């Protein structure tokens, strides 16, 4: 849990590299075909 929160997927394929969680969530939105600005404009709505 600590790795997948502070490092995303990087720790599973090498050294753990820190990255902020709201920014990590933007990466994962890109994986399903959604642009980054969608998350940043609804961060308070998504988090709730």
């Amino acid at each position: 849990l600590a790795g997948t929160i502070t490092s995303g997927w990087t720790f599973g394929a090498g050294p753990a590299l820190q990255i902020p969680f709201p920014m990590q969530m933007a990466y994962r939105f890109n994986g399903i075909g959604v642009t980054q600005n969608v998350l940043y404009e609804n961060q308070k709505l998504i988090a709730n």
């Binding site: 709201p22 642009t35 600005n37 940043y40 404009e41 961060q43």
Partner: peptide, 27 residues
Amino acid sequence: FVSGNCDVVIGIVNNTVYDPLQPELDS
């Protein structure tokens, strides 16, 4: 790419985005 204003995003910062076409406008 551009999307929206500078108010709904938390953590946005000042900076400059360089325009390649502007230097070509002079000539």
